[PDB]
Amino acid sequence: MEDFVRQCFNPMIVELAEKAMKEYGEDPKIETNKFASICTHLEVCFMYSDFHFIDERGESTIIKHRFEIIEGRDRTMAWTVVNSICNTTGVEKPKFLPDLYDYKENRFIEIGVTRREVHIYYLEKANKIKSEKTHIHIFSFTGEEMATKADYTLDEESRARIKTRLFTIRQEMASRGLWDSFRQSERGEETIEERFEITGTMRRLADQSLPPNFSSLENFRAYVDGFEPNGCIEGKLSQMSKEVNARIEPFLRTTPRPLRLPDGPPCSQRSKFLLMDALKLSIEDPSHEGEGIPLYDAIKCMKTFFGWKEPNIIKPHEKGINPNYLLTWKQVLAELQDIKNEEKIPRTKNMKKTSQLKWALGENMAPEKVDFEDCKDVNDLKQYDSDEPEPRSLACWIQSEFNKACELTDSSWVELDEIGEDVAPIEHIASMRRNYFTAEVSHCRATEYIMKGVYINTALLNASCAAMDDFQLIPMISKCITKEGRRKTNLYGFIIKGRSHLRNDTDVVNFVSMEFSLTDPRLEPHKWEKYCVLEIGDMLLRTAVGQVSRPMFLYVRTNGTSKIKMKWGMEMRRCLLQSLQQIESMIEAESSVKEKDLTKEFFENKSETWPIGESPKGVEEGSIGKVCRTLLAKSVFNSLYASPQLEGFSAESRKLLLIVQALRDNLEPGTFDLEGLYEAIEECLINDPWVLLNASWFNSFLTHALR
């Protein structure tokens, strides 16, 4: 506002208004509305006075000055001027201070600029000041005006100029967000400051919001206003017991201890689909009729396998009814045969509701929702079971999963879109880095997992959206490019989706997944506690003795998913980005130390190896491609096994890693509650196989780094 006042009026009026405010001890910085009011009044008075002269005969000509200003001067000097004028012209003494003197009309003219309506202002002035023989002119910012007896001393041109000036000032204040305050600061003929009082309920609430030894907010304000620092902190510190301290305990090579992993039965697999036990039936070069539509591709993939036999239960699901799973598989086979022999198959196939499918999808198993009062006397009624989760011990199968996810596959799984040609040298460096990383990770098993998750989650989401209340059959499919460059379509199994009345993002749609496999569950039953595994056929494999027929099993389980989970699965390609970033980050960090680009040293050296694993002999080193694939697998497993325990462990063990690093840098690390940090880390280790594997990894790293 003050900036607007200074930039809007000419410096002469600004100085006049500043002097006027100084005369009354008013600071323009704090009283901005009063400053603007004074400036506007002075501007209007000067515009009224200016451009008005008196000819030699007595008439007024527009070019003796017709007007004498009385407002823009000191009160004593203004009184002197008014007294001289009255004595010379024999006019009556004005009771209050006038604004100017009109010589032609021989009177005292008072000009008032009103933020409110003109007539109210005029009535107030008449009831307050006018009294006798005083002309009053009232202007408004809206173009209105008023005068005594509708008599306007000035010509229409000057009045129009004043009206235009006030109108434009109003418009600029409105555009600058200042007109509201300016208009709300006028009461009568004065200009008050902002008012905001605490009274009534608010005053009592404030009086109840103080330190213990104060009764009213005014007393607390008085205490704070006169407060001066007199050794308060020093005295309080001298009064506080020495038991309140932050004693640094040294962190040496012998202080850290291994994390205590939980005990109990070994953990089990909880992924949505098989990872290293997955078996796929593949069709190369998909050139069949109706290509690109999952149902027909699944049909063709099924046709390529001969060896189907009578299914039977080999690994029962201790919690479920196995015959339901067996009948679901039989029904899937029967419906596939039916569509095959029908010779006219549509884009989607919705399973017919059946007892086996109703049970396997948990249909009607949801307890009915009733008011608590109507069922508060039930003896069995209890708070929803949220007991402490049962701890599980680390099992060796998760390490094998990661090892298999870190290795190369005989075919490519990701095909990225092209970008523009590189021109800048930094663009060439970026392209080299990205191309090396992509060449190292394009054939990784983790890329296959990424594509599997993306495809399966996309299909599940689309089926849920379209077939709202139908038992849709969704084949689990992925696409690949072999070394020869021929496209291949792989089928891992099928998913039957139940009712999908998904209103919110966190409500569950239940599905049943059947997945082909070549691994016998009986070797690791604890890994498959949530599965019912059937032996569905026999597969011929070529070995040194010819064609060996090994059993082919079907891992069947009921699972559930939400919209958020499906979206999370569909975004798995981001994992690749993450891994690349990590690799890039390392290079950049190293480059900063070496003051040169190290992309070639990282990738083209082919003699630098990083410690990336452990064996009975000791720490094992791997090439850059191995590091890239390992980081990609870690990202993919973080995405697949995302849980609160994982992020808790990551956050808490980052501190311990940094402390160990500071120890390795000879920076004399020290802690305050190291045991507390260990407790925080170990509270996240209950049952998740991925988090337990990460904890075991940290223990091994500690063993090797302390040495």
Partner 1 sequence: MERIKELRDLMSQSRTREILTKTTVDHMAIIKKYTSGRQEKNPALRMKWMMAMKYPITADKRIMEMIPERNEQRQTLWSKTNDAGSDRVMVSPLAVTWWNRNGPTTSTVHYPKVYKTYFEKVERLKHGTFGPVHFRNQVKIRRRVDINPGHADLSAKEAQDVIMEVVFPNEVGARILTSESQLTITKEKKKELQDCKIAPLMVAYMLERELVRKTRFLPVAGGTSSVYIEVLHLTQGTCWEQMYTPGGVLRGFLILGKENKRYGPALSINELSNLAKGEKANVLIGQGDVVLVMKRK
Partner 2 sequence: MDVNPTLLFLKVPVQNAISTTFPYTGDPPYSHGTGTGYTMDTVNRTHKYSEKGKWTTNTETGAPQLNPIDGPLPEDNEPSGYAQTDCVLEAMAFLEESHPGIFENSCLETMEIVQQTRVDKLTQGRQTYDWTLNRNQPAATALANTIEVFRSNGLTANESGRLIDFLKDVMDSMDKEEMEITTHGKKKQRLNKRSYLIRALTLNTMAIATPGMQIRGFVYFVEALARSICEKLEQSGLPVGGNEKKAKLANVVRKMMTNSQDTELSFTITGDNTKWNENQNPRMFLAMITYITRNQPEWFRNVLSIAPIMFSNKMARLGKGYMFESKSMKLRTQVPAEMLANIDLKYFNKSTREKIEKIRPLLIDGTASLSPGMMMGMFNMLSTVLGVSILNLGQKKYTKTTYWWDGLQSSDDFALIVNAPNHEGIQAGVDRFYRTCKLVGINMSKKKSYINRTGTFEFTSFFYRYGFVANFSMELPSFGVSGINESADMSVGVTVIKNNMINNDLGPATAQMALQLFIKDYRYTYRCHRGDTQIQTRRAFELGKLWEQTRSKAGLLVSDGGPNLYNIRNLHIPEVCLKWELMDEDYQGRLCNPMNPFVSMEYDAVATTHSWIPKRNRGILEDEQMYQKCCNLFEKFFPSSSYRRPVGISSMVEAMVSRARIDARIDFESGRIKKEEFAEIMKICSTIEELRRQ
Q: What are φ and ψ of residue 336, in 5° steps?
A: -65, -45
**Closest approach of partner 1 to the CB of residue 460, in Å:** 13
10 in contact with partner 1 (CB under 8 A) = no
Q: Which of 350, 400, 403, 591 binds partner 1 (CB under 8 A)?
A: 591
Residue 129 annotated as lining a ligand binding site = no
Task: Report what 150 binds from partner 2, partner 1, none; CB cut-off 5-8 Å by kind.
Answer: none
Q: Write the binding mask 467 to 506 for partner 1: x where contact by CB under 8 A, - elsewhere.
A: --------------------------------------x-
Residue 156 CA to its chain's centroid (Å): 62
Q: At what angle do helices 624-640 and 689-706 cross, to 10 degrees?
A: 140
In angstroms, the CA 605 to CA 38 distance is 79
Residue 380 annotated as lining a ligand binding site = no
**Closest approach of partner 1 to the CB of residue 582, in Å:** 14
**Closest approach of partner 1 to the CB of residue 464, in Å:** 11
Q: Which of 4, 152, 167, 305 binds partner 1 (CB under 8 A)?
A: 167
559-571 residues labelled b (16+ CB within 10 A) or e (exposed): bebbbebbebbbe
DSSP state of 65: B
Residue 99 annotated as lining a ligand binding site = yes
Nearer to partner 2, 310 or 417 (CB): 417
Nearer to partner 2, 236 or 542 (CB): 236
Nearer to partner 1, 571 or 614 (CB): 571
Task: Report what 670 binds from partner 2, partner 1, none; CB cut-off 5-8 Å by kind.
Answer: partner 2
In angstroms, the CA 410 to CA 270 distance is 27
Nearer to partner 1, 157 or 318 (CB): 157
Q: Write the binding mask 375 to 414 for partner 1: x where contact by CB under 8 A, - elsewhere.
A: ----------------------------------------
**Closest approach of partner 2 to the CB of residue 530, in Å:** 19
Residue 354 CA to its chain's centroid (Å): 44
- The tokens describing 574, both together, are 């981001």
Task: Report what 337 binds from partner 2, partner 1, none; CB cut-off 5-8 Å by kind.
Answer: none
Q: At what angle do helices 217-225 and 200-207 cross, to 10 degrees?
A: 50
**Closest approach of partner 2 to the CB of residue 441, in Å:** 11
In angstroms, the CA 634 to CA 690 distance is 10
Residue 111 annotated as lining a ligand binding site = yes
Question: What is the 3 state secondary structure string of 471-496?
Answer: EEEEEEEEEEEECCCCEEEEEEEEEE
Nearer to partner 2, 105 or 291 (CB): 291
Do residues 173 and 40 make contact, with C-beta atoms less than 8 angstroms apart? Answer: no
Element spanning 89, H or E: helix 75-89
Q: Write the binding mask 132 to 161 for partner 1: x where contact by CB under 8 A, - elsewhere.
A: ----------xxxx----------xx--xx
**Closest approach of partner 2 to the CB of residue 125, in Å:** 23
> Of the candidates 489, 475, 476, 477, which has an alpha carbon nearest to the alpha carbon of residue 411?
489
In the chain, how long is the greatest CA-to-CA distance?
A: 139
Task: Report what 643 binds from partner 1, partner 2, none; CB cut-off 5-8 Å by kind.
Answer: partner 2
**Closest approach of partner 2 to the CB of residue 462, in Å:** 13
In angstroms, the CA 95 to CA 593 distance is 85
- Laid out side by side, the sheet with 67-69 consists of 67-69, 100-102, 107-114, 135-140, 145-147
Q: What are φ and ψ of residue 19, in 5° steps?
A: -65, -45
Residue 564 annotated as lining a ligand binding site = no
Q: Which residue type does 327 have?
A: L
Q: Which of residues 409-438 bind partner 1 (CB under 8 A)?
A: 423-426, 429
Task: Report what 465 binds from partner 1, partner 2, none; CB cut-off 5-8 Å by kind.
Answer: partner 1
Positions that interact with partner 1 (CB under 8 A) = 142-145, 156-157, 160-161, 163-164, 167-168, 171-172, 174-175, 179, 423-426, 429, 461, 465, 505, 567, 588-589, 591-592, 594-597
Binding site for Mg(2+): which residues? 41, 71, 99, 110-111
